[PDB]
Structure formats: structure tokens, C-alpha cells
Amino acid sequence: MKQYLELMQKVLDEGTQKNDRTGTGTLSIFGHQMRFNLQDGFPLVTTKRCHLRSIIHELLWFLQGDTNIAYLHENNVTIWDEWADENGDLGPVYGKQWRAWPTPDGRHIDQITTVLNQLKNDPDSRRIIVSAWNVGELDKMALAPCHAFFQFYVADGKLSCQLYQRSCDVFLGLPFNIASYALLVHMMAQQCDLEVGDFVWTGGDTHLYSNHMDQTHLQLSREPRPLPKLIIKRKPESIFDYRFEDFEIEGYDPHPGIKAPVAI
Amino acid sequence: MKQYLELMQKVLDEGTQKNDRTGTGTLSIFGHQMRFNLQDGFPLVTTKRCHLRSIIHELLWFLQGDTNIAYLHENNVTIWDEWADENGDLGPVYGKQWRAWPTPDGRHIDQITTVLNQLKNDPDSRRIIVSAWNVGELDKMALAPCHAFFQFYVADGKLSCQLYQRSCDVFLGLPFNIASYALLVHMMAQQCDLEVGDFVWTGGDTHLYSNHMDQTHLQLSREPRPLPKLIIKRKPESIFDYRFEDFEIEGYDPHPGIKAPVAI
Numbered sequence: 063m064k065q066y067l068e069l070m071q072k073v074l075d076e077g078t079q080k081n082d083r084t085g086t087g088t089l090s091i092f093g094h095q096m097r098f099n100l101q102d103g104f105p106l107v108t109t110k111r112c113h114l115r116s117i118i119h120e121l122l123w124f125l126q127g128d129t130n131i132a133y134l135h136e137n138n139v140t141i142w143d144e145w146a147d148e149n150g151d152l153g154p155v156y157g158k159q160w161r162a163w164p165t166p167d168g169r170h171i172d173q174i175t176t177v178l179n180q181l182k183n184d185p186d187s188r189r190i191i192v193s194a195w196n197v198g199e200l201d202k203m204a205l206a207p208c209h210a211f212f213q214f215y216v217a218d219g220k221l222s223c224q225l226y227q228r229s230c231d232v233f234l235g236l237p238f239n240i241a242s243y244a245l246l247v248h249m250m251a252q253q254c255d256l257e258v259g260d261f262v263w264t265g266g267d268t269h270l271y272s273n274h275m276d277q278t279h280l281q282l283s284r285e286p287r288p289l290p291k292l293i294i295k296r297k298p299e300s301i302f303d304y305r306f307e308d309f310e311i312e313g314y315d316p317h318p319g320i321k322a323p324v325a326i
Numbered sequence: 327m328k329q330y331l332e333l334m335q336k337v338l339d340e341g342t343q344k345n346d347r348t349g350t351g352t353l354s355i356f357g358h359q360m361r362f363n364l365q366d367g368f369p370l371v372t373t374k375r376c377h378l379r380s381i382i383h384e385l386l387w388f389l390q391g392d393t394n395i396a397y398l399h400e401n402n403v404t405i406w407d408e409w410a411d412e413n414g415d416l417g418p419v420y421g422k423q424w425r426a427w428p429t430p431d432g433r434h435i436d437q438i439t440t441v442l443n444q445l446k447n448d449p450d451s452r453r454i455i456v457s458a459w460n461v462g463e464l465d466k467m468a469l470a471p472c473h474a475f476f477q478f479y480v481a482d483g484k485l486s487c488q489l490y491q492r493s494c495d496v497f498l499g500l501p502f503n504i505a506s507y508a509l510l511v512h513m514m515a516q517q518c519d520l521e522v523g524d525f526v527w528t529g530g531d532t533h534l535y536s537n538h539m540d541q542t543h544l545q546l547s548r549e550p551r552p553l554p555k556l557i558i559k560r561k562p563e564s565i566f567d568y569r570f571e572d573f574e575i576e577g578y579d580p581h582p583g584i585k586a587p588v589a590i
């Protein structure tokens with residue numbers, strides 16, 4: 063989509079070569095922001111084919127508060143397999159922090175129903191935030207939160223969200239991370255009787271792995287297609303009540319898929 | 327500064343009227359990014375005289391892990407007075423989270439020592455982060471962290487920093503918060519023998535209070551002037567050892583100060 067392909071060109075035009083944790087090497091920029099108006103269409107990348115099925119299941123998993131991959135395995139999603147231990151555990155990553163952030167005096171905060179209650183009862187709050195960056199449990203996590211912190215905002219009956227992604231693999235994770243949060247914004251807005259506004263993506267270390275260069279130029283030679291449309295077929299009683307079958311993407315005609323190795 | 331006045335105008339042309347928690351009223355936008363190259367000069371606003379003494383003592387108060395305004399008073403800095411209790415405490419705000427984030431099991435993480443050790447031993451890390459947004463202690467704080475989360479980055483021997491500020495009073499808090507983190511970048515870079523890079527500012531709810539319209543219009547009438555340069559006179563033996571006397575600003579020629587009421 064125009065924003066995404068301009069980001070790729072930007073990393074190529076001004077990225078600095080950097081060595082990294084996995085030993086693969088990246089081309090990197092620091093600091094970027096893009097905005098997607100969710101009323102223009104659902105932001106699912108069309109210059110390569112993305113698997114919506116994996117995106118939806120991972121988001122339903124996060125919302126259930128789950129951090130073990132068995133659910134994802136029951137649904138034929140293997141995107142988190144490489145970081146899971148022998149028991150299928152990833153440690154207190156996203157789902158646990160969203161649904162049960164532990165306090166130092168023995169409580170657990172459910173940040174997702176806190177946010178829902180804020181949007182319903184106090185939508186002009188400047189504190190409507192969900193953080194996955196829990197400094198005291200970072201060491202128990204298989205991988206530190208890439209999409210770390212996000213904030214909601216309501217203006218003129220529309221819900222907007224801004225995500226700070228501290229680390230971003232542009233080719234592989236970012237198509238998935240944009241679609242996932244746009245989906246979350248449609249579900250929140252449906253629960254609060256709000257319209258969808260903007261998804262704003264802000265990035266920290268935004269990079270392209272050295273072994274993704276050919277597939278990046280191949281993708282960069284393609285014209286974006288019209289954006290698909292998201293249809294939710296049901297309003298569940300709670301945001302924790304949605305299921306895969308409630309969503310319908312319409313009009314998605316992508317270019318061929320492009321395979322790329324994930325750096326572990 | 328060009329970017330600062332540009333944001334100021336953008337909030338006026340684009341802002342939506344919001345009833346906020348103080349019953350004052352704001353015009354706000356959501357999602358904004360600004361980039362300051364620290365090689366070009368220290369970003370202290372010149373279209374109004376800013377008081378650097380207050381900026382320095384607050385940042386030094388933060389690095390000492392102190393949340394009691396007694397120290398600020400010892401140095402006659404009055405900025406946090408309206409939020410402290412009968413004993414001068416603000417609760418576990420900025421300073422406490424930066425130097426002793428409480429783990430669920432009773433320990434504390436010093437995020438500043440962690441960051442110094444990462445910049446020295448692993449500068450390619452994509453995890454060099456300080457979070458003041460401690461979900462389990464927010465209810466104890468007099469005001470929730472405005473400048474909430476920040477990340478360091480190193481490329482080509484230069485140290486960059488991005489701040490995510492979830493709530494921003496453009497006229498009062500922002501000149502102050504920008505100078506504050508530019509200063510911290512200069513001190514970290516000196517301790518880690520790096521050159522300064524970019525200070526990237528990203529805002530969430532970015533606003534102008536209804537009772538600052540006149541002084542915002544006054545400020546928008548003034549030509550920005552060349553940026554000052556910062557000199558750190560002494561190299562302390564740790565980042566916890568700077569003192570007010572070690573910093574000099576040079577070439578700071580501002581337009582006259584502009585007085586404006588704070589919303590409490």
C-alpha cells in the first residue's frame with residue numbers, strides 16, 4: 063500500500079547497515095510515523111499475498127490472555143513456533159500483559175477492559191493506553207515486545223489508535239502488525255458504537271534484514287491494488303467473544319506471495 | 327524553532343475542541359512526530375525565553391530517583407508544586423520508575439544503569455528502552471507520566487533518542503520536555519563516548535489549552551532565531567554525578583518570556 067512501500071524505499075534510501083542480535087545484519091532507520099485512515103479500506107498489504115487467517119487467530123489469542131502456542135497449533139498457525147519452549151510457552155508476552163499485568167502489591171490489571179471502560183465512560187481521557195513493556199518480566203519473555211505500547215483517542219465519534227513499535231522487521235512482521243491493530247480498532251469501535259478513525263504507526267528501529275533485499279525490490283516493483291474491505295457479521299456481547307467466522311474480508315486481490323527467511 | 331511553531335499552527339488549524347479533565351478545554355490533534363538533529367544546535371525554544379535552570383534541576387532530580395519536590399525547592403524550582411501532597415511527594419512518578427522500577431516479587435530494576443550498560447556493551451540492541459508507564463503504580467501517582475516511554479539507538483558512532491509523549495501541552499510543557507531529553511542525550515553520549523544524533527519526538531494527544539490562545543498568537547508572530555550550543559564543562563565519573571554547574575548554554579538569544587496560567 064502506498065505508505066508501506068514508501069517506508070521500504072525510505073529504509074533503502076537512508077538505512078544504515080547495522081549488526082543485530084540474530085547475526086543476520088539489517089539496513090536500519092530510527093524514527094518513522096505513518097497514518098492509515100481506516101475508513102478508506104482495511105490496511106492489508108496487496109503487493110504480496112498475506113494470510114489473514116494467521117493474523118486473526120493471533121489477535122484472538124492475545125485477547126484471550128494466552129501465551130502458549132497450543133491454540134495457534136489447533137488452528138494451524140505456526141508463526142510463533144521458533145521462539146516457544148519445549149512446552150509451547152513464550153513466557154509473559156503480549157496476551158498476559160494485556161489481560162493481567164502484575165502489580166507489586168499482588169493485583170493484576172486487565173488493560174483491555176480498562177481501555178474499553180475508558181472509551182465508554184471517559185473518551186476524552188489522554189491516558190487510554192495498553193502497555194506490553196513490562197520491565198520487571200522482560201527477562202521471562204521468549205522475545206521482548208516489538209509492538210510495545212499503544213494509545214486510543216476519540217474525536218468526532220471516531221476511534222483512532224497510535225502504536226509505538228520499538229523494533230520492526232519491515233518485510234515480514236510489519237504487514238501482519240498493521241493488519242492486526244486495524245482489526246483491533248474495528249472490534250473496539252464496534253463495542254463502543256464508535257466509527258473507525260486512523261491507525262497511526264510509529265517505529266523505533268525500523269529495518270530490512272540483509273537477506274530480504276531481493277524480495278524487497280521485487281515487491282517494490284508492484285503497483286498496490288485497491289484496499290480490501292472488512293465486514294464484521296456480528297456484535298458479540300464482549301470484545302473477548304469474537305471468533306474467526308465473524309470476520310469477512312471483501313475485495314482482496316493481491317500480487318503473488320513472496321517467501322523470506324525469518325531471522326531467529 | 328521551525329518545527330515547534332509549525333506544530334503550534336497545526337493544532338490551531340486542525341485541532342478538535344475537547345472537554346479535558348481540568349475543565350479548561352483544549353484544541354487537540356492525535357499523532358505527530360518531530361525530528362531534531364542535535365548536531366545543528368541545542369533545541370531550546372528561542373521565540374520565548376525558556377528557563378534552563380528549572381529544566382536542568384528537574385532532569386537531575388529524575389536521575390537521582392527522587393519523587394519529592396524538596397530537592398527542587400532547595401534549588402528554588404517551583405514547577406511541580408501544584409501536584410505534590412502535604413509532604414511534597416508526587417508518588418512513584420518518573421524518577422522512581424527510571425531508577426527502581428518495582429518487580430512483582432519485591433526487587434527493583436534500575437533502567438538507567440541497564441541503558442548505560444547496553445550502550446557500552448551492546449549498542450546495536452533494539453531494546454534500549456526506559457519506560458515510566460508502570461501500569462501497576464499509576465493509581466499512586468499525582469499525575470500520570472506525560473513523557474511516557476523512550477528509546478535509544480546508536481548508528482555510525484551517534485546516539486539518537488525517540489520519546490513517546492502520550493499527552494502534550496504544546497505551549498507550556500513541550501519547550502521544556504524537548505530541552506530535557508536533548509540534555510539527557512548529551513549526558514548519555516558523553517558517558518558512552520558517542521556523538522549526539524537525533525532527538526525524535528512523537529506525541530499522542532497534542533493540545534493547546536483554550537486559555538493560551540493569545541500567547542500562542544503572540545508567539546506565532548516571532549521569527550525563530552539560531553539555536554544555542556550546549557557545553558558540558560566537566561566530565562563526571564558517572565551519569566549520576568552531574569551538577570547544575572557543569573552545563574553552559576551559549577548563543578542563546580531568545581525573544582522575551584511569555585507568561586501563561588497552568589491548568590491544574
Ligand SMILES: Cc1nc(=O)c2cc(CN(C)c3ccc(C(=O)N[C@@H](CCC(=O)O)C(=O)O)s3)ccc2[nH]1
Nearest residue numbers: 113116141231234235236238320321322324325326
Ligand atoms: C526477526 C523477526 N522478524 C519478525 O517479523 C518476527 C515476527 C514474529 C511473529 N509474527 C507476528 C509473525 C508475522 C509474520 C510471520 C511470518 O512468518 N510470516 C510468513 C507466513 C506465515 C503464514 O503462513 O501465515 C510470511 O508472511 O511469509 S511471523 C516473531 C519474531 C520475529 N522475528
Ligand SMILES: Cc1nc(=O)c2cc(CN(C)c3ccc(C(=O)N[C@@H](CCC(=O)O)C(=O)O)s3)ccc2[nH]1
Nearest residue numbers: 376377380405406495498499500502584588589590
Ligand atoms: C496542564 C499541564 N500542562 C503542563 O505543561 C504541565 C507541566 C508539568 C511540569 N512541567 C514539565 C513544567 C514545565 C514548565 C512549567 C511551567 O509552568 N513553566 C513556566 C514557568 C516556570 C519556569 O520554567 O521557570 C514557563 O515556561 O514560563 S510546569 C506538570 C503539569 C502540567 N500540567
Ligand SMILES: *c1cc(=O)[nH]c(=O)n1[C@H]1C[C@H](O)[C@@H](COP(=O)(O)O)O1
Nearest residue numbers: 083206208209229230231235236452
Ligand atoms: C518482533 C515481533 C513482531 O510482532 N513484529 C516484529 O516486527 N518483530 C521483529 C523486530 C525485530 O526484527 C525482531 C525482534 O528482535 P529484537 O528483540 O528487536 O532484537 O522481530
Ligand SMILES: *c1cc(=O)[nH]c(=O)n1[C@H]1C[C@H](O)[C@@H](COP(=O)(O)O)O1
Nearest residue numbers: 188347470472493494495499500503
Ligand atoms: C504533563 C507533564 C509534562 O512534563 N508535559 C506535559 O506536556 N504535560 C501536560 C499534558 C497535559 O496537558 C497535562 C497532564 O494531564 P493529563 O494526565 O494528560 O490529563 O500536563
